[PDB]
Amino acid sequence: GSVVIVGRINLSGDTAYAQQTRGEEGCQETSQTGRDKNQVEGEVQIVSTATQTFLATSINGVLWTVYHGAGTRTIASPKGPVTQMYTNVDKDLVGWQAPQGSRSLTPCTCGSSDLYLVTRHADVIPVRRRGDSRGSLLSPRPISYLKGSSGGPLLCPAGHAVGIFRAAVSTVAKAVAFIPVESLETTM
Ligand SMILES: COc1ccc2nc(C)c(O[C@@H]3C[C@H]4C(=O)N[C@]5(C(=O)NS(=O)(=O)C6(C)CC6)C[C@H]5/C=C\CCCCC[C@H](NC(=O)OC5(C(F)(F)F)CCC5)C(=O)N4C3)nc2c1
Ligand SMILES: [Zn+2]
């Protein structure tokens, strides 16, 4: 079956807000056909397979997500199922050509230490950068709050993309792992 856009997250100036466009019944049927006529908008898509929901982030003209969510699946589109352009399991990274109407985030060149994880609810969670692929949460959170947010963006204060959220370190989450925008460009 195909990955399906079921909603999205829009970044408005210094804010993010979510919208739902599809429920479980529509997700299951569109996953089967791979045919999706819904208009696309936003930098972050809420995506779903038959059985898992997660996020996808547009960067550099590619809609990126995690392999552990998408597998090798196509993504539903107005012209039917679209094959992945990029698949790297070692990076836990897949990507498809970005849908017409999504807006690509700008890769960050700030070097900032303050990062902001966007969750699937448009919650913006502060994070302290610790290198290029890890971040420490300012307040620990039950991992429940972060589940379903893989493939969403870490942003810098200016709103640029720093990386794709991959996994969380926990024992309550204390830290997060993300794929740096630099690794996406190397893949590309
Ligand atoms: C099948 O072929 C594959 C190929 C490559 C691959 N690569 C990774 C790293 C992987 O890991 C899985 C899924 C990740 C996940 O849960 N991702 C988040 C998420 O939201 N997923 S999701 O959207 O709910 C879902 C599953 C898509 C629907 C974003 C978190 C939020 C909450 C975590 C809840 C407890 C989990 C804590 C765990 N911790 C961790 O693995 O930490 C490490 C670190 F210590 F950081 F190094 C990475 C290696 C160890 C974790 O994050 N995952 C476990 N599976 C695969 C599988
Ligand atoms: Zn920046």
From TrEMBL:
Disulfide feature: C108-C110
Residues given in the record as Zn(2+) 3 binding sites: C108, C156
Subcellular location: Host cell membrane; Host cytoplasm, Host perinuclear region; Host endoplasmic reticulum membrane; Host lipid droplet
Domain of life according to the entry: Viruses
The Peptidase S29 domain, residue ranges: 15-188
Residues where Zn(2+) 2 binds: C108, C110, C156, H160
Residues reported to bind Zn(2+) 1: C108, C110
Function noted in UniProt: RNA-dependent RNA polymerase that performs primer-template recognition and RNA synthesis during viral replication. Initiates RNA transcription/replication at a flavin adenine dinucleotide (FAD), resulting in a 5'- FAD cap on viral RNAs. In this way, recognition of viral 5' RNA by host pattern recognition receptors can be bypassed, thereby evading activation of antiviral pathways. Cysteine protease required for the proteolytic auto-cleavage between the non-structural proteins NS2 and NS3. The N-terminus of NS3 is required for the function of NS2 protease (active region NS2-3). Promotes the initiation of viral particle assembly by mediating the interaction between structural and non-structural proteins.
Entry's family note: Belongs to the hepacivirus polyprotein family.
Subunit structure: Homodimer. Interacts with host SPCS1; this interaction is essential for viral particle assembly. Interacts with envelope glycoprotein E1. Interacts with envelope glycoprotein E2. Interacts with viroporin p7. Interacts with serine protease/helicase NS3. Part of the replication complex composed of NS2, NS3, NS4A, NS4B, NS5A and the RNA-directed RNA polymerase embedded in an ER-derived membranous web. Part of the viral assembly initiation complex composed of NS2, E1, E2, NS3, NS4A, NS5A and the mature core protein.
Protein name: Genome polyprotein
Organism, as annotated: hepatitis C virus genotype 1a
Lineage: Viruses, Riboviria, Orthornavirae, Kitrinoviricota, Flasuviricetes
Residue range from the parent sequence: 1030 to 1205 of 3011
